[PDB]
Amino acid sequence: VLIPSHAQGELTGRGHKWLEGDSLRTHLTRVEGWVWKNRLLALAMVTVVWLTLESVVTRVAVLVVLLCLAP
Amino acid sequence: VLIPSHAQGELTGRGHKWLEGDSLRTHLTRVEGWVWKNRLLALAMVTVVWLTLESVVTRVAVLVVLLCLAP
Amino acid sequence: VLIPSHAQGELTGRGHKWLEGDSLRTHLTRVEGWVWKNRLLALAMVTVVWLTLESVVTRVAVLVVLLCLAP
Amino acid sequence: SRCTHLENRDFVTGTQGTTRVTLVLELGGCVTITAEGKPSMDVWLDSIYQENPAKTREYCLHAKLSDTKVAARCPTMGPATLAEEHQSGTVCKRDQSDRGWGNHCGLFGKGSIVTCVKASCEAKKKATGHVYDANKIVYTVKVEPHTGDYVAANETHSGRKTASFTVSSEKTILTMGDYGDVSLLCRVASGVDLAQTVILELDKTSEHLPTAWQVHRDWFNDLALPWKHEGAQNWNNAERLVEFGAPHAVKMDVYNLGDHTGVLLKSLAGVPVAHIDGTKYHLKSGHVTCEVGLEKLKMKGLTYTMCDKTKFTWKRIPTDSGHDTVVMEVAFSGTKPCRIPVRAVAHGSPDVNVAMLITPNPIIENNGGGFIEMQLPPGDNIIYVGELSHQWFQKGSSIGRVFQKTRKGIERLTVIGEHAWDFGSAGGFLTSVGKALHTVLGGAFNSLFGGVGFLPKILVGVVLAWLGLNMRNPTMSMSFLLAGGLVLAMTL
Amino acid sequence: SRCTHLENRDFVTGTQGTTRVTLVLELGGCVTITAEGKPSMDVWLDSIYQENPAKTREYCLHAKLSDTKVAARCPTMGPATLAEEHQSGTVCKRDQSDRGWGNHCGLFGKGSIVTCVKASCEAKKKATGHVYDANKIVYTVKVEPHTGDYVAANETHSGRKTASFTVSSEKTILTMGDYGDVSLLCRVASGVDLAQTVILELDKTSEHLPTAWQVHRDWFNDLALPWKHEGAQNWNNAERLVEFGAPHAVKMDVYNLGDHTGVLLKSLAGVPVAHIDGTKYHLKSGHVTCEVGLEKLKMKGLTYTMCDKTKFTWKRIPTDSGHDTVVMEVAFSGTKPCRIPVRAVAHGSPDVNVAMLITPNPIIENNGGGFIEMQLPPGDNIIYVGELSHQWFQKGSSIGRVFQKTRKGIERLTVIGEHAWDFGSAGGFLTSVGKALHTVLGGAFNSLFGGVGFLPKILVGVVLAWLGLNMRNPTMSMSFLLAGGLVLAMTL
Amino acid sequence: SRCTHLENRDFVTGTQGTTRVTLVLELGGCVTITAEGKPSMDVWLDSIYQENPAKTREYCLHAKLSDTKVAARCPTMGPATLAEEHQSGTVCKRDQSDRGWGNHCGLFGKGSIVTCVKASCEAKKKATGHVYDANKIVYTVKVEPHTGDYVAANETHSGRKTASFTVSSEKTILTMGDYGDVSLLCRVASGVDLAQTVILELDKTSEHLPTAWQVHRDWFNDLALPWKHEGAQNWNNAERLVEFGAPHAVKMDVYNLGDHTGVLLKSLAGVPVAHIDGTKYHLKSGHVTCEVGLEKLKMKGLTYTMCDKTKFTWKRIPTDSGHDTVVMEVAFSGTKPCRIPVRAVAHGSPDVNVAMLITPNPIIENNGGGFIEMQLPPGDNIIYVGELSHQWFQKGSSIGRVFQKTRKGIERLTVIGEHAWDFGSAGGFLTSVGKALHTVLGGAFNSLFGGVGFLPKILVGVVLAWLGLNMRNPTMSMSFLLAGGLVLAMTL
Ligand SMILES: *[C@@H]1O[C@H](CO)[C@@H](O)[C@H](O)[C@H]1NC(C)=O
Ligand SMILES: *[C@@H]1O[C@H](CO)[C@@H](O)[C@H](O)[C@H]1NC(C)=O
Ligand SMILES: *[C@@H]1O[C@H](CO)[C@@H](O)[C@H](O)[C@H]1NC(C)=O
């Protein structure tokens, strides 16, 4: 069904690379577009965590996990 | 570049549906193959999580979260 | 009527006269099938024995022994 | 009967004195509407289509590229320029190249370079979106009497009457021959939510694909592909198919990412199919709410004599329909017309005619009759047709049948949603309150949920459950109420 | 001086009594060897290639389907079967369909159904993998003396020398005329890993794509598409481009999932391109270690007379090169051969020369000589060539050059990995210790989290940090600094 | 009196006014029906058969192998392939040989090898599984009046009557001659479970074997043999009779495992034999429920005169039937016809009759009569037939007979009660409660422990008893009490 990618760091060298920049930062775009759909729930979800985790520091880790799980 | 999966999105009822079941299944096959290649590291991280205990449900939550975050 | 299996005698360990040495492992499909056919009873035995015993290793080893005694 | 052909028929019924019964005619389903002292009918919705629905926008799936041109200038000189930057319909890029006395410049450093290409769509590689018009959508609903004639699915019953419903069309009266006039209203305003819905064509008449798909307005409008309006001469964002190479000396390459079609077809996975029939674009899901006016149907042949009990023969012995009905056909060699002497006797009550016929007053006539369908209670029965008989064991169980009817109800409520609440009849308090609460809750939920998807459902459920375990104050119990409510609803 | 044409020049320097210098030549790089009392050399790995590597596999990118056939059996008439189920090149599926008196069976229930199509790869839609052979791959090393006559990248130097290396090779002696001999020994077994590498090619004639990609072996072996070895007539897993719709009563539809090529091209995105030149399959990444025996190099022209100071003129005025280095060319109109009086005097300091000449003992000859290269101290300078003078200002800074040089060391460590210790290595115990530490750390980090990729490695690293934030004992506290090292190892 | 021939005889009794009696008939068993003022009948199920059953599978018992072919490749020359790999009716295997200089390859290593053979089934070496059709099986019930004539097992009673019940059978009237008329009805739906029965037939003319066996459907479907459906051209899973030797250079060897008939017949143990009679396929184990109607039976010769007391003579003296009944036969030599003066008294001669005559109103006919069957109270009795007399001592105690009757009830109760609790002529107020309890108990005790078998059942019962010894609290002890009931039911 599906073709996976493989890690950028495997072979490297100084040769020209196909789509050299497209391997990484592009993955953030789906998250931002996801936010731009989710926004009412997203802020709600954030505030749900924010109000419950009065333990401040673990807010960040939890929300990072949730955002990275977010398609 | 990316196109999001519509598979759930229309929630539509009785009829005939394109490629439905393999859409759901392939995500699980992704996780299973990732686990299969990981298993040395996965078992290591399992024992590392054993070095920790807020609760066993926390242990399995963190493990599932990690396996779902990675491919 | 019965013929005793030669692997009980196995007059020389150097032998190669049949597949049968690997087939003996395939015959564990008897236990596994008995598992697969009776999973709910096994899980019952699991839920029983995981709760009734205090010892932790017996809460594996006894169930393993019973499932291996099951034909 | 038609509905025999389908694994999904509903036996709507009405008591004596019942008229103008209400149905919700799901596409891919059938209704066997049976009324005391009246002819039974089969009713169903056969098509939902619109002729030539208007179109929204087009995408391209495979770019054709031509006239690649490049220019570059030494590092201290200035920016590179092409007229092909202004001549719209091109794709272009500006970048910088290392230069020096290796490349006949006077001074080492990075100098400007520009590249442009013409782009167009490959032949027949378009995709197109169509949208329904709520005042041009057409519905069609067919009725067929239970005449006691069987007719295979590749034949047409002589009493199959068709109504076509457009929202401008009032009550329709259909004369069912001898049985009199049925009437319908099927107000189109209860149809599918056309605003959500786009039909996707792929331009090729492919021999091995569905001819069109039905997709949500959002997903179709979101596609990261080059696009245009109909009859606009050039594509917007054509660069989405064109990737430039990294600069090298006075040169840049242009690489073409090729045919996306396999990507789109895979991304469609999960989507409902549709159909195209010349000019007519058919949906394959939906429903409409029909009022059915039974008040003028009449029995046929209550005044005929019985048949001679002797002369019946099994053309086709009683057999299980899978609908918990017994289906059979007899042939008769006597004089015609006459009434068929059907009976069924339970083992427990040798004098009781337990047969609950679906077929009304089963009749033999000069070119037809003798097909019979009946329902029986579970256990052991003997069916009779005069002197002819057959031992039938009705395999079900009463509680099992009730539980199955609950499963059917849950399925209907899941697939239809809130409209299911007013299936059968207005139903008073239970139906109207169920509809009111289900509409309000489902609307608020869909407003939050719409597009969140399956695994995010599971994630949010597990998160809310964990918080319900973790946190202290009594309100958290309500959060758990939400957690369980979502989790079960989504898992169901 | 070829290395001026590249960005990534390197310098290597030898005292008197330098002998066999060690180098790590890298494809797309170029090493200027310099030594006291000797002519300087440019050295580079020109290319790596093999003639006609063995084809590992073909993959198919677009299946043609044809000759769809179907067979079905009523619910008790057992499995339906077709002669097509056994033949080569057929894709088949078996399923069940709901059947009954609606489609002329006697029993209501699930009939058996089977369908088959011919499946064949369409035209040019194949990807071919090729594998190198250690016994036959040729490493071409080139060498060029600093003779001081300039040439463009578009023109071939009068004295460029080629050595070709293979397992059959030895210490190779290259005779560079009056510059003497030079000795190359290059370890073919020290080159790229020829097992891990596969050349992937599509249709080479594709106008807007590179000819090939240097993919990793395990990825190519784990590709999903239909595949076969060379010469085999029938595609394995041909069903993977095919899908069957749900069974209707007596029919199953068959669909073609279309051209996969766009998916493959997208998945490539990590990959370095490769190249094909007729039969010669070239790599575009790699390196070899070599030992360059300088011991028989010879200075030319030390017997020649000095040039007349009066008679120089600029053919090319001084300029920076971006190698922190000044290059120039002079004409001359006296009698010749002669030696060029080149000097640089900083400013306000007339008696201390600062000209670190890289082109040694500069000379002018009949149709030769006149190009000069030097490095200068930061700040104001005056450059002289006889009576000719130019007021060069040397930009940069004293510490800035040291920083830049040490940064290049980090880039070298990043792209070479382990072997960077060999570059310039004249054997030393500290270097051996460095190589031991780097080999053990690299072995651990390549085994542990090998192939995990940067985002999942960030994930694991931060998870390991989190698992140590506030803990019962210091006994494994090294784990946090190991995570820090892992982060650093991840970062680059 | 046929059923004197047969162990597993049962007695059934109707009161005065008893008109209709339920029975369960079974193969190898008989009911002697008696009622006040009515002639006795022997009723039995003669045979359960179907003409020309359908068939389910053929299994092969001995493969014929031929045309072994092998292909092999040197270690890097990819997969070896044979043309026969895709031909129907072949068995193949692929493996790796070891290769080197000694096998004319270039490289030491592992090299692909493939072997294929044609496979066919030996002549007359198939097993065929036949299966019943519920609409066509015939349930043959026979009835004989007690006329007081004796006939051996190899003689036919003059008044034997037969009915052949079927799904079409309705209700049968059997004219018994001078004894009047009996109504008889049987429910084929209540018969053997036709679903779970397969008739395994081996190929013809085996002299020392059964003709066919009656086997469980899942066991038959789980046979570990090559198989095909009816009329299919080639054998599935043909490899099950073939083994491949380890590969050795270019060579690989094929071993036929030979005739599997022995392991089949040794697996057909504890399995009921079936029978075949031309085209009629007979069961040998089964039952049916019937509803005997004593309404119209009447007694011959109630107006006949008493015989001469002096002219009797024993032809067969009183002897034990083994059913706790006495059987005898008298000749008579006077004028005829007349009623036999049978009576019996307990010792002490109280002149109170204690003969329980099973034979109704015993008569010497003009050409028949004179057999008599009696039951008597325990201990010492004197039988009289006119003046003819014989001292008889009746063995069992009354409590022994009561216990023995309960033991017979329990003995039938497992087979009949698993089918149906109501053997005992509708003790409905007790019997329906007993049936309900036994139904739910059997549901539990079959959904648990289903297919576990008696010894593993008992072993798990002992495990549950040890858990009883481990029961921490009273509710747990109640769960043990439930396991006690289970282990009792499984040991019984
Ligand atoms: C319908 O299908 C049956 C298939 O058995 C065929 O015999 C019959 O002629 C068909 N009739 C029509 C009107 O297509
Ligand atoms: C490149 O070199 C060729 C000969 O090798 C020469 O004719 C040409 O002029 C050169 N290019 C330029 C731009 O001068
Ligand atoms: C019945 O069997 C007996 C003993 O075998 C024999 O004397 C008699 O002739 C047989 N009668 C018939 C009709 O077979």
Author numbering:
A (entry chain E), B (entry chain D), C (entry chain F): 2 to 72
D (entry chain B), E (entry chain A), F (entry chain C): 1 to 492
Tell me what the authors wrote about this structure, in their words:
Tick-borne encephalitis virus (Orthoflavivirus encephalitidis, TBEV) is an enveloped single-stranded (+)RNA virus belonging to the Orthoflavivirus genus. Orthoflavivirus particles have icosahedral symmetry with a diameter of about 50 nm and a genome of about 11 kb. The glycoprotein shell of the mature infectious virion consists of 180 copies of each of membrane-anchored E (496 amino acid residues) and M proteins (75 amino acid residues). Envelope proteins E orchestrate the early stages of viral infection, virus entry into the cell and receptor-mediated endocytosis.
Formaldehyde-inactivated TBEV strain Sofjin-Chumakov is produced in the industrial scale for the vaccine manufacturing process and represents its antigen. In this study, we performed the first cryo-EM structure determination for the particles from the clinically approved TBE vaccine preparation based on a Far-Eastern subtype strain. ELISA studies with monoclonal antibodies supported the hypothesis of TBEV protein shell cross-linking upon inactivation with formaldehyde.
